[PDB]
Structures are given as structure tokens and as C-alpha cells.
Design a protein around this ligand. Structure first.
Ligand SMILES: CCCc1cc(=O)n2nc(NCc3ccc(-c4ccccc4)cc3F)nc2[nH]1
Ligand SMILES: [Zn+2]
Length: 346
């Protein structure tokens, strides 16, 4: 059918929409941090990645877990690709001079002061800070009991996208070549991240993702007739929720640890490329459309191939990233869900 899936999406929608003081608590903390960082020599160009009043919830089942990004513009950037990894880069070349080690911008130093400044502002305020191996997210704050906020520091570059993206973002037959060109004129972001430990940064395009999801049809009027939607966004929510529920179901074992929403999002956008017509996403076909997505993700697990949507030579499912045993384990869980009308969805 398609009836149970609607009930799941309705539950998720009402949980997200219900009245809550959490966004206001998060806002007060964030505004406090931004004011403090702006009067520091290294962070005076810092600001929120998106200045909307609705915060980012990466975990679709967790309305008390917030994700925020602080962006810092860096003029005249020089990038050097690290170890042929396509997605990881040294930063070379002003205010960030204090973090150089040679010609190379040190992420770990920059995070240390970012953390320290945030640490000394938290005490000035019911907020607590936790350091855990990371840096993207750089800092996790906890507000009262339930509310948590991940803060990521990102560099912004307004120069052309790196060569590794030249053949990515293959939306030309879905969103048009005109739109691909406008999107590629937008800035790109870099977040501190190791590939496996050097001073490397990873390309981040979460603003492009958000723009496409809000203007996602082949037809420009897609989903504007509010009673005859497409089901693209619902399919992506369902895929996100499937992985989150399986990860929770098996938090005691380790096999699903390396999977994240990047993997589900990526597979979904490949199915959007595969199926560019809005008629392939009719809301009546929610169940069949979700099954296309599930089926494609399962093909990717079995072939151990999932190309990054922006950098096609980066294989998210390579065996050095996620080993065979872990991919084979997620395959069997998903095919049990698929064959039993998704028990995690009730
Ligand atoms: C719209 C499709 C989804 C999407 C959103 C977004 O914001 N971005 N941002 C990049 N940047 C490039 C990039 C990012 C992460 C990883 C990665 C991830 C896990 C493990 C290892 C490596 C590999 C990469 F090549 N890719 C994406 N895809
Ligand atoms: Zn639509």
C-alpha cells in the first residue's frame, strides 16, 4: 500500500510543527556566541550560514537536536588537494594569519581558539560544552536536558568550485543546465575533517542541497498546487527515518556506525536524476516511489558503489570507507524491513 507511509509522515510532521520553546533557547545562545566571536581578531567575519529563524534538524526523528553552521569568509584562498582524495584539501593563501603553520592553514589550532572562546562565553551565561573527537561538528552544546546544538565552523570561498566537482551536480536533465550554471556560481564551504591526521578541510555544499529541495521539480510550478504535490521530499524523509530507526535499533552493535544521512541523501538525489519527470513522483505513488528509492540504495550497498553527488569520483561505499561486513549487514536489515512492511515505521 501507501497508507502506512502517510501515517508515518503525518506523525513526523506534527512532531516537528508542535509548539516548542527550544528554538528560542537555541537562538539566545547562538546570538550570544556570535557577538562574542565577532569581537575577536580571528573571527570578526563570522556569521550564521543561514539566517533563517528555523534551525536545521539533521536527525529527522529528533526535534531537540539542532545543527548550526558558523561561516567565515576567506578571500584569496589557495586549495591543494590532499592525497588524491578529491574531497579533502589543504588551505593556503589578513586575519587568519595567526593559525598558519608555514603556508598551510591549521584547522586544529583554529578549532582550539573557536572552542576556547565559546567555552569562556558559555560560563558567562544553563549551557554546558562537550568536546568529543570531531571538529565538524566542532562543538556540541547541551541546553537543559533534551536540547542539544552542534556547531560547525566553515570557511566560505566565493571562487569557482574545485576541479573535482566539474562533472558532478548532474541535474541538467532534471533542473536544467541553466540552473546548474546558476548554482555553480554560488560559494562553496570547507569544514575541518580528516580523511581517515593532517590539517585538511572537506568541501561542503549543504546550501546547494537546501536550494534544490526548495525548488526541486522539472516543472517550475511543482508543489505550488498544494493539493497535487509530488512526493520527492516525503521519499527523502522516509529514507532518512529508515536509517535513523535502524541505527537506533542497533546502537549496541557497531555495524551501522559509519552510515549517516549523507549516504541516504546521496542515493535519493541519484534517483531524482534517474527519474527527472514530476509525473514519476506523483503523490498517489508514494509507496512505489519510496520503493524505487529503497531499491536503488540496496543496489548501491550490494555493488559497494555510491558516488558523491558533487564529486563523482568519491565513492561513499568504497571498502576503505565502509567495509563489506557493514554493508552486507545493512542490506539484510533493509530487505527484512522491505519484506515485512517496514516494522520500524510503527
Ligand atoms: C545533495 C546530496 C548530498 C550532499 C549534501 C552536501 O552538503 N554535500 N557536501 C558534499 N561535499 C563533498 C563530500 C562530502 C562528504 C563526503 C563524505 C561523507 C561521509 C564519509 C566520507 C566522506 C564526501 C564528499 F565528497 N557532498 C554533499 N552531498
Ligand atoms: Zn514537488
Amino acid at each position: 500500500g501507501a497508507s502506512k507511509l502517510r501515517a508515518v509522515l503525518e506523525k513526523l510532521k506534527l512532531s516537528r510543527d508542535d509548539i516548542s520553546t527550544a528554538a528560542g533557547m537555541v537562538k539566545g545562545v547562538v546570538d550570544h556566541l556570535l557577538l562574542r566571536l565577532k569581537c575577536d581578531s580571528a573571527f570578526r567575519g563570522v556569521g550564521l550560514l543561514n539566517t533563517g529563524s528555523y534551525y536545521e534538524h539533521v536527525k529527522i526523528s529528533a526535534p531537540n537536536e539542532f545543527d548550526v553552521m558558523f561561516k567565515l569568509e576567506v578571500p584569496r584562498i589557495q586549495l591543494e588537494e590532499y592525497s588524491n582524495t578529491r574531497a579533502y584539501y589543504f588551505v593556503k593563501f589578513n586575519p587568519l594569519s595567526q593559525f598558519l603553520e608555514g603556508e598551510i592553514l591549521s584547522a586544529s589550532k583554529m578549532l582550539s581558539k573557536f572552542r576556547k572562546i565559546i567555552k569562556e562565553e558559555i560560563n558567562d551565561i544553563d549551557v554546558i560544552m562537550k568536546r568529543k573527537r570531531g571538529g565538524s561538528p566542532a562543538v556540541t552544546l547541551l541546553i537543559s536536558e533534551k536540547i542539544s546544538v552542534d556547531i560547525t565552523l566553515a570557511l566560505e570561498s566565493k571562487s569557482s568550485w574545485p576541479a573535482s566537482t566539474q562533472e558532478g551536480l548532474r541535474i541538467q536533465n532534471w533542473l536544467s543546465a541553466k540552473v546548474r550554471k546558476q548554482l555553480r556560481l554560488k560559494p562553496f564551504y570547507l569544514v575541518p575533517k580528516h580523511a581517515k591526521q593532517e590539517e585538511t578541510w572537506r568541501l561542503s555544499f549543504s546550501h546547494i542541497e537546501k536550494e534544490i529541495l526548495n525548488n526541486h521539480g522539472k516543472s517550475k510550478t511543482c508543489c505550488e498546487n498544494k493539493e497535487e504535490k509530488c512526493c520527492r521530499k516525503d521519499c527523502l524523509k522516509l529514507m532518512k527515518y529508515l536509517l535513523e530507526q535502524l541505527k537506533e535499533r542497533f546502537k549496541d552493535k557497531k555495524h551501522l556506525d559509519k552510515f549517516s544521512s549523507y549516504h541516504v541523501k546521496t542515493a535519493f538525489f541519484h534517483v531524482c536524476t534517474q527519474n527527472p519527470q514530476d509525473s514519476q513522483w506523483d503523490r498517489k505513488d508514494l509507496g512505489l516511489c519510496f520503493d524505487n528509492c529503497v531499491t536503488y540504495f540496496l543496489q548501491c550497498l550490494r555493488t559497494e558503489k555510491l558516488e558523491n553527488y558533487f564529486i563523482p569520483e568519491f565513492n561513499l561505499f568504497s571498502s576503505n570507507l565502509i567495509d563489506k561486513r557493514s554493508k552486507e549487514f545493512l542490506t539484510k536489515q533493509i530487505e527484512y524491513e522491505r519484506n515485512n512492511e517496514f516494522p520500524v515505521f510503527d
